[PDB]
DNA sequence: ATTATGACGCT
DNA sequence: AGCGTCATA
């Protein structure tokens, strides 16, 4: 009754950009605007690698994975726009500094926790609080909510899409009890006010597209979010998750797309994130474990309290390269030579990093792969970082790992390196 | 031969 | 610490 924890205590945003490397460069290149088109690393093999797909392409079939030479099987007038190659590899430089953009925007309206190169939630609960005090008990006009759309509206008792979304629009605003400053309802809406206005400010600064999801958690938010992608976002209230969630595939949740959501639908022989209501917390916690049993109780419920963490920033610096099939490095001279391309390109992102953010790295992690093993990683290994020069963290990731080579003769590599990856991680403030 | 990342959990 | 899981362009 009156003690049920209802997880309405929040306002929480998530913001994601549309197709984010297409976008960034089609912003550069006005010819790949609004016309199928993709975002290629390398070239040579099957004519390169998608990782991102504008929307009029994905109306072909394209998809991320899909090799280039395939996607244009689907959509012969594919456009392409290739990521930049230094020292040997694909650089993402110009999508992180990017994603910077609208980090830094997104940033005026609320501390943000970074979630990836393109997204971040907002903990908008104070702002709200703010905006309803202003707002003075007046009701919330259609017009601050262009691109809102409300879960689960309309309903009850026009055949076009923009027409649904306020038809939808309207119910929700008709029902709202803007008198009260402590709704749950009502702060969503003010929340979602507020993220049409922070999605304007990153359009109008950036030229960048992007959707969000609002509600009272992150999994919620981000599940909101793309519910009505691209170019829109989506109110989704605690009152619309059981009629959600009642159809709603248990591997869509964040974090139960892998094992544990399999073994949930395994074990429970459920199939909707709304079937686990029916299973005590201790019976969750028997099968899944304490954290997890206890996290899936409250989620299938509407509930989470995972908080936006204050952090704009990534908390490690990391350059990786694959070589696969015959290019896998079989040499010291090629080992060492492929350490050096990426201790180079992590000396540069660090330097820049401590001009910028100031702090500094303090330990190098070194990862390889060796062909065979079937895991992304096979060993992993640290040692001090103690100076941002690239020969040095070069000449030491080597060091760390110079006993894999299974050869008798030190001038082959045996087995072959399919995978080198340096990371800088445990930064302290300089 | 999807690749290049990046956060967090377990023991 | 080193490994595993899950995630996103
Ligand atoms: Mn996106
Ligand atoms: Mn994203
Ligand atoms: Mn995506």
Redesign the pocket.
Known sequence: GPHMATGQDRVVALV??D????QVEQRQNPHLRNKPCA?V??K???GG????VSYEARAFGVT??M?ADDAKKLCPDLLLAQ?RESRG????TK??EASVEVMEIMSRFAVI???????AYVDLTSAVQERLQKLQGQPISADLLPSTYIEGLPQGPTVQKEGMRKQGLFQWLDSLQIDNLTSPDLQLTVGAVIVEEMRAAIERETGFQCSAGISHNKVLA?LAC?LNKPNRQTLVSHGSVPQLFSQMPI?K???????????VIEILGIEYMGELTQFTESQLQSHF????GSWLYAMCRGIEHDPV?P?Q???????????????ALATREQVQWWLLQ?AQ?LEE?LTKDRNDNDRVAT?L?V?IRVQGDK????????CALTRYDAHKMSHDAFTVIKNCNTSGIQTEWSPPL??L?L?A?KFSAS
């Open positions: 994601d950009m197709c984010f490397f297409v975002v690393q390398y040579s093999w099957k690698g998608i990782i991102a991320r994975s090799w990521v590899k694909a650089n993402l999508y992180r926790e970074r979630a990836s190169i393109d997204e981000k793309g591997r949740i964040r974090s139960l797309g892998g094992k544990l959501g399999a073994s474990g304490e954290k997890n963490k952090r920033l990534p908390k490690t610096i990391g350059c990786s390269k694959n070589f696969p099939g015959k290019t990426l390109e992102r330990q992690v990862s895991r992304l990683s096979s060993l992993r290994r640290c399919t995978m990856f990371c991680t």
